[PDB]
Amino acid sequence: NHEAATCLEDVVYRGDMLLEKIQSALADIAQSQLKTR
Amino acid sequence: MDKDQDLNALKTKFQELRKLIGTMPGIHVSPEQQQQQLHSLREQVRTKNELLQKYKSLCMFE
């Protein structure tokens, strides 16, 4: 169970990094569309 | 005609038609601001195209 929890935590860190990058990209796209309008 | 009928009526009708066509167009102000807005829209379209292109480049997901 500890090994499974460690694997799940690694996957959760990967997913959190991916979500942070996606949010950053979305905010960048939004700011670009705002400044270009 | 006078070198040696209702020509003035037809001329006035043509002038009124030309004025109506000019007012129907929409551009009242000088074309300077129109060209400025067109350049701004072109810049915005270029920015949107560049953003859409850059979006399809960074593809590092699983």
From Swiss-Prot, chain A:
This is Mediator of RNA polymerase II transcription subunit 21. Component of the Mediator complex, a coactivator involved in the regulated transcription of nearly all RNA polymerase II-dependent genes. Mediator functions as a bridge to convey information from gene-specific regulatory proteins to the basal RNA polymerase II transcription machinery. Mediator is recruited to promoters by direct interactions with regulatory proteins and serves as a scaffold for the assembly of a functional preinitiation complex with RNA polymerase II and the general transcription factors. It comes from Mus musculus. Expressed in brain, heart, kidney, liver, lung, skeletal muscles, spleen and testis. It comes from the Eukaryota. It is found in: Nucleus. Belongs to the Mediator complex subunit 21 family. Component of the Mediator complex, which is composed of MED1, MED4, MED6, MED7, MED8, MED9, MED10, MED11, MED12, MED13, MED13L, MED14, MED15, MED16, MED17, MED18, MED19, MED20, MED21, MED22, MED23, MED24, MED25, MED26, MED27, MED29, MED30, MED31, CCNC, CDK8 and CDC2L6/CDK11. The MED12, MED13, CCNC and CDK8 subunits form a distinct module termed the CDK8 module. Mediator containing the CDK8 module is less active than Mediator lacking this module in supporting transcriptional activation.
Curated annotation (Swiss-Prot), chain B:
Component of the Mediator complex, which is composed of MED1, MED4, MED6, MED7, MED8, MED9, MED10, MED11, MED12, MED13, MED13L, MED14, MED15, MED16, MED17, MED18, MED19, MED20, MED21, MED22, MED23, MED24, MED25, MED26, MED27, MED29, MED30, MED31, CCNC, CDK8 and CDC2L6/CDK11. The MED12, MED13, CCNC and CDK8 subunits form a distinct module termed the CDK8 module. Mediator containing the CDK8 module is less active than Mediator lacking this module in supporting transcriptional activation. This is Mediator of RNA polymerase II transcription subunit 9. The lineage of its organism: Eukaryota, Metazoa, Chordata, Craniata, Vertebrata. Belongs to the Mediator complex subunit 9 family. Residues 5-58 form a coiled coil. Signal peptide: none annotated. It is found in: Nucleus. Component of the Mediator complex, a coactivator involved in the regulated transcription of nearly all RNA polymerase II-dependent genes. Mediator functions as a bridge to convey information from gene-specific regulatory proteins to the basal RNA polymerase II transcription machinery. Mediator is recruited to promoters by direct interactions with regulatory proteins and serves as a scaffold for the assembly of a functional preinitiation complex with RNA polymerase II and the general transcription factors. The modification Phosphoserine is found at residue 30. It comes from the Eukaryota.
